[PDB]
Amino acid sequence: TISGVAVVAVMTSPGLMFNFDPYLQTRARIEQLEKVGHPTDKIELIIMGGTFPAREIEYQDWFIKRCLDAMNERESKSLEEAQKINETAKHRCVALCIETRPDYCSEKEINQMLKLGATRVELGVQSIYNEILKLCKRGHSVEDTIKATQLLKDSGLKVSYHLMPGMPGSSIEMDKKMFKEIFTNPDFMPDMVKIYPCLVIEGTELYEMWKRGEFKPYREEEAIEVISYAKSIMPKWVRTSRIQRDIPATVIVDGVKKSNLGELVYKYMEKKGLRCRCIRCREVGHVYYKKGILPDPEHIKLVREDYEASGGTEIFLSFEDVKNDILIAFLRLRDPYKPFRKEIDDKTMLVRQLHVFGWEKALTRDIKEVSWQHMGYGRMLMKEAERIAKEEFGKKKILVTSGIGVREYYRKLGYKRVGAYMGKEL
């Protein structure tokens, strides 16, 4: 399926073909997507490596600047100028995701990520059990994950967890309990999870453990059982990544090698009667592609679900066909717990995300182009968020975490730049 948002994933320096040049990587991906008719007016930029927040600030600012230069199609004098230019460019950076180790997620680093324009942070959690983390000689603790998650949430950012079932020392039941805990213990409650079973790749510590007879990775059966469980209990407010990996099968010494693990999980869940209600399974574009149906307007409602997370309250607002369970748009509103950013006080509510599922060329059906943007759903969710913030929680200002290329949208709704955010006085 072709999405309206182009994902541009780039690699930082210690990809290979361009010597890790940020501009060349970004440009090459955009041109490659244009070659196949994919829209590139909206770009999600993903910074891969996991060590980016530990690099020199000089390097971080330059790297992001040059990615934006490629989107803007012109040179700039500074990061700030490239960001300003990009607000009205032909290729707008609507989201910026930074991958990082949980222990590289201090207040100082979060300040830097906000300066860069980040909207999402993916934590290399892997496991929530310190026994497993220490056994595999990982460089972080679950305490690091818990603290990073709270600091990110209280700064308005989206939080994703990379999780690895089947690590040394774990078990099917241990993995299942981990997923239950991540969605029902307020220390965690991520917005998004990226799941793939632990693999044995030559040259890693996991390879050494495997060589010694300390590690037998999951085969397909076990991975399917764990991931199927995880999806069956995922809350409606959790977004999941397409189950896959960019690692070719010839480098996998041991572990799951087949390329359709996601499809195998789907068929397993069908066989067992396991339903999935998370964002990816219910979003309008995915439902049309998988099941050939569209939202029934007689049954579209504004729905609300609250949960406790990182000491505060998350409000998940959505427009949904509640007869067919099809998700059209959603907004993540947070009453923060212990913020540190200068622009967030105890009378502030945070809009951490607004997403209206938009254009999408489903090549395999007959209704070619389908979209729910420009129909009012985004504006209606914002109005409801403002009402809740003011009337129910007594807040006086609301701050939106906005992609660089989305600021203009919030300006139309009366918001103005407040530090790193778009803000409105209630």
Author numbering: 74 to 87, 123 to 534
What does the paper say about this structure?
Elp3 acts as the catalytic subunit, but the loss of any of the six subunits results in hypo-modified U34 tRNAs in yeast, indicating that the complete integrity of the complex is important for its function. The enzymatically active Elp3 subunit of Elongator contains two functional domains, utilizes multiple cofactors, and conducts a unique uridine base modification specifically found only at the wobble base position of tRNAs. The two domains form a cleft that contains several highly conserved basic residues, which bind and accommodate the tRNA anticodon stem loop (ASL). The current model of a radical based Elp3-mediated cm5-modification reaction is proposed as follows (i) Elp3 recruits SAM and cleaves it to generate a 5’deoxyadenosine radical (5’-dA) in the rSAM domain, (ii) Elp3 hydrolyzes acetyl-CoA in the KAT domain and (iii) an acetyl radical is formed by the products of the two domains and (iv) is transferred onto the C5 position of U34 in the bound tRNA molecule.
We further generated five different N-terminally truncated versions (MinElp3Δ1–19, MinElp3Δ1–41, MinElp3Δ1–46, MinElp3Δ1–54, MinElp3Δ1–68) to facilitate crystallization. We used full length and truncated versions of purified MinElp3 in crystallization trials and obtained well-diffracting crystals for monomeric MinElp3Δ1–19, MinElp3Δ1–46, and MinElp3Δ1–54. Although all three versions contained various lengths of the N-terminus and also showed no signs of degradation, we could observe interpretable electron density only starting from residue V72 in all collected and refined datasets. Therefore, we believe that the N-terminus adopts a highly flexible conformation in the absence of substrate tRNAs. In our MinElp3 structures, we could not locate any bound Zn-ions and instead observed the formation of a disulfide bond between C384 and C389. In addition, we observed that the acetyl-CoA blocking loop (aa 466–486) is positioned outside of the acetyl-CoA binding pocket, interacting with the last visible residues of the N-terminus and also contacting a neighboring symmetry mate.
